[PDB]
Nucleic acid binder design. Sequence first.
RNA 1: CGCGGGGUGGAGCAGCCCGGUAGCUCGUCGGGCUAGGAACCCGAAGGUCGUCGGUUCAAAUCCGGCCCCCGCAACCA
RNA 2: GGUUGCGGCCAUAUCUACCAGAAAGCACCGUUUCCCGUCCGAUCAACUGUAGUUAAGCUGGUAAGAGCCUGACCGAGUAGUGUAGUGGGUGACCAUACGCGAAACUCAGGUGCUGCAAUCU
RNA 3: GAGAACAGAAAUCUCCAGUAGAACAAAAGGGUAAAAGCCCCCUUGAUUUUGAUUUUCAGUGUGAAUACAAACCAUGAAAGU
RNA 4: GCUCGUAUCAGUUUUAUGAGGUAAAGCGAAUGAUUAGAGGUUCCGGGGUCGAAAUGACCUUGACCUAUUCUCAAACUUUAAAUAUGUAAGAAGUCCUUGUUACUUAAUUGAACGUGGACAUUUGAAUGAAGAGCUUUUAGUGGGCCAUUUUUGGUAAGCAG
Lengths: 218, 294, 159, 58, 169
Amino acid sequence: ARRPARCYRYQKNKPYPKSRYNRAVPDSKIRIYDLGKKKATVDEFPLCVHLVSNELEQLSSEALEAARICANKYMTTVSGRDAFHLRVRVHPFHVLRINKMLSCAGADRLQQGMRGAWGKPHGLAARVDIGQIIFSVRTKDSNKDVVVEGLRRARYKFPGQQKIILSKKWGFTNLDRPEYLKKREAGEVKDDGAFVKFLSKKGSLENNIREFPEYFAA
Amino acid sequence: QKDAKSSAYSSRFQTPFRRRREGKTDYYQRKRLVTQHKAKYNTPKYRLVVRFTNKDIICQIISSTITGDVVLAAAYSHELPRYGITHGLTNWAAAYATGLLIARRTLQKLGLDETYKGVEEVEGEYELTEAVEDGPRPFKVFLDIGLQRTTTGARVFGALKGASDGGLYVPHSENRFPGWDFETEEIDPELLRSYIFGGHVSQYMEELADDDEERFSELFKGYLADDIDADSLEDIYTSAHEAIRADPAFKPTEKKFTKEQYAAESKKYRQTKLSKEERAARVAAKIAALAGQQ
Amino acid sequence: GKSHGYRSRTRYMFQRDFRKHGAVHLSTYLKVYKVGDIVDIKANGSIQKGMPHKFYQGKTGVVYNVTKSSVGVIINKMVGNRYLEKRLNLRVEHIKHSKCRQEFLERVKANAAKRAEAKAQGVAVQLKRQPAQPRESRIVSTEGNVPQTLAPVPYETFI
Amino acid sequence: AKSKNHTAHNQTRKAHRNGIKKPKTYKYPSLKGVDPKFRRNHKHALHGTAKALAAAKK
Amino acid sequence: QNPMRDLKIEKLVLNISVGESGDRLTRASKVLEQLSGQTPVQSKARYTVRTFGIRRNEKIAVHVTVRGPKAEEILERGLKVKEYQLRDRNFSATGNFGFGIDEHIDLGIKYDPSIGIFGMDFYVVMNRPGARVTRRKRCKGTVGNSHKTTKEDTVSWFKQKYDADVLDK
RNA sequence: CGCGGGGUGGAGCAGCCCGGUAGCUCGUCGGGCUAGGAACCCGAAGGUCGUCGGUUCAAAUCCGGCCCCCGCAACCA
RNA sequence: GGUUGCGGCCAUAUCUACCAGAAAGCACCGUUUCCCGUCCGAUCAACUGUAGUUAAGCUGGUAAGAGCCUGACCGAGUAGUGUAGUGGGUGACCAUACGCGAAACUCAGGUGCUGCAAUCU
RNA sequence: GAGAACAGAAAUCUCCAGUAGAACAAAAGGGUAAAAGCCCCCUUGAUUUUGAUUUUCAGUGUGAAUACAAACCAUGAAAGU
RNA sequence: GCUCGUAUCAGUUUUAUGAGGUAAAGCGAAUGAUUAGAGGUUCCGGGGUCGAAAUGACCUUGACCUAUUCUCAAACUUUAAAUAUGUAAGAAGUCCUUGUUACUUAAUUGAACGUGGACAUUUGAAUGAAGAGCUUUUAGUGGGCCAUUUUUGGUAAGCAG
């Protein structure tokens, strides 16, 4: 039995991470932050959809895991496992405390009241801000409705208000769609494992020649 | 794993002082050598800097300012041929002669030459420049040895002895001189005098002539060529002593040329930095050639 | 319990600097201080003798005493509802000259020079300083500078 | 019966009622705390200059 | 070019790391002293481990360093027991090399029942003129890449001198 | 619900605290002259310790994340 | 302009990898009787400056070099923040008014300067 | 990191890299690289006299500390400490 | 009350010059957290061919090397505000052959204190000044509480700080 999230919704305390001074806190309910075809190339999933926060509040690890499970389940049900890449982009680092006591008749016989009321760790939450992304799903443009609907389903597990925004960037890159297109029909971009490597006008020319040969051999 | 120097390492690296990187100056010792008593407001603290290169000795009387050090007078061993010492221009006797020359030069510059006449008849004994009654105190300098090793019988203390006998009041003990014995805490005046007057080289000459003629012909070849004998090098060292105490005025050289001529020739040879335009030209040529495969 | 030691809550105040640790360069020792000099106090974390208290970090005082490796500084400390005289015995590592007065001496020298020139000629020196005045009339042209009309931009996601 | 532990409330107003007027500065501040070697020489030199000034204008 | 950057032996270090201290180390020091013609120096443990039976500052080993023609003679008399057959594994990346031998009597030392049999580890530190730059006090420097000794030049020098041979692997 | 004991062969106890890691009881077949047996102890298998990151003194017992009464817990209303 | 001794500021000076260095200087370099110090003249000490070499150190040049430094209407008047309202919003928070105002990022340029003394085609 | 008999993850030896990621009696934070770390040599200033000063502060005390004065010593070649 | 009479001033700005490590920011910068994805031998793990012979040699999970910008820190930080904060803006000031000294200097070198000498009607920013400064003595009080903003404990409280 855990406390209702209305008791920890708001960012009342300073950040309280697990550290050398906490050193005994529960494990986060969410442990997997990448789902779907997370190994896909950047060219494969051009469209990106964000579920972003519109409130300054705390998102529980419990709620994060529930919403991630719900959205992943919906996308795998409707369009398939290898049709998308979902990234949970908030990690619960803030530790919530509880002043636990016996709850029974004659409870004042061991309570001690508010004396020594410092709490012990009992949960984890992610501290999110206005406009901060919570979920990021990259997929093909054919899967836009599927992905927005999966994010809309995930929205029900979260407190506060969230928005679904179609990113102007290419997938999980920080390049706009046409700017990335121009940089890719040029020779500046390179396929990494899952992200994109960039060519800059700095650094040693021998290393620049060794990498990105298509730009230079033009 | 030697070349693990990340950009973070190079960014957080704190480079030492330039002279500490060059390995020339000890700043821990320099602070105590240069930090003047504050109630002695601007009165300078004088260091007798002594340095020993290969085939040369550099003795300077140096004060300190914010903009940099200031030299009072300098005496190099390579100038001692003018006074009458050509060989062993770095040995202990030459260190003593250079110290004597720098002390005499400093006293000539300051006008403290007639007073504090120094020790003209040296005997290898321990003695400091005693201040005269009702008269100006002797010019006081402190020995600056730098990174050199303080050990008994060293030529830094040879230069120290030379300057102290020349007339400078430089505070020192006698237990770093040649002739000081560890078992019996006393100084051998005759051993110190022989080291002053070149006895430690004349003795080697005698022994080497007796036992190994090839070594004597190889080293001491200048001594042989000039026909200088072990009994006569003492005479030449004392003759240089009296000459130094006669005319220490420091006549410099002629340079055989002008600073402008030296500058023109050296600049003409020296490599010149590439301009930024030709730097970009080289880069773009590399793009056009190496990347294009001709 | 609570702790209020001499160097309490000085964790960052006496931290040396970024890439400025180690020995102290010799200009701080070659600088001289006379009685009456105005000096700023900024403690050197590396030197632990003659260290000012954390109250006097960033305070400016006047020298009243010069000793072998130290100066005595007069400071007016606010205690209660009044100012009290405090005399610190600090080291030159933590002591440094003040430019606040030096600007004023430069101005007084300039004022004397203008006074002399006035005694020579009488050309309305106007020694006194003045605050920034309201801007006078000017004429700005549009030749090669025709105004560019601007409008508020529409809102777009950017994310 | 717990009570209030500490507050600086009203303290600045109380100070500023008749408060933080600056310290009264004096020409010739006290020589206390000065180097006694300097103080000895200052006594001797002041004696000497008083004698010289008397000789100049007796 | 190669005016004076020809390889030479900077030093040769002979060490015997005895398990414990006492008579065993005393006799190891005796044999090392006899072989090197000079008193050796004994090295105490950096720290304590119970498995090896060593304590901190317990005089684990005895080693000596030699320079010059004596170093050359000891090196060749220790290569004889190897039959001039070393390995590129034995040769190091920094240009030095070494090899361990057992039964020191093979070097030409008669057996004594008290002293017993002792094994040592020869290590030759190879260099060229100019290491004073990195070993002196004033104006320290680091030798240039061209002047730096290497595994390849060391194995070449070792198979040229002593007309020896380095094993394939 | 109070830092209170381990989830160790099928069962209950060593070993956890000083480093090549099957220690007692049940069963299957021999031991062993037996006249069968009863008993005796010797061997074969049976615990890869409820389980994730280890910083490797080969760590999972001497780092940390979830259930179990106990050596027992009140106070005047 | 080169070099050295002593420095000031203490990376524009550091780090990596290649080149060049006339003269002098610096250096490596040669030796072990003395002073001296080591397991070891390797360091340190002394002596010769003679036997040799610019190989190294050192100096300089090169590099769409790392780092560092400087600047920018580069990002950005953004984040933040002092003051104000019987402003909005259930709230969380937010907008506006009068002011101050970043850091990261991007780009551009640079890669020691200088003092005292001595000295050199 | 590379290397050397036993010797291996850990014994001793050797080079390279190494901005301190070590150590500095203890808590933590500062600080320290030809040192404040490690090792060695010498030593007793952990001494005497009585004042001034900073912190807590009432500008009382106590504790601690700071810079001198007059001595007498230690160390070092010395500046100095 | 006293000494004086517009200053031996100021809960303010300005100008000049210090100090700070919070807000923010940062983590392809240190420390500590933290999510994913290329190649290399299994000495620097385990699961398998070419077995009575290695490190001719390849696939999976994972460990370390790289280049990676997913997210963070009250007891993390290169950077770093705003607001608050020290000092100065003159006549007790600025400059000159230095008269004294047992201090100091190699030294009539300095240090400190001085005589004498050059400098007002603009004596050196703004605004105000409703007099400035200085004592003596004594009352009551020494339970506080509320509001905006910053902020701690607590689910919170017309709660506690």
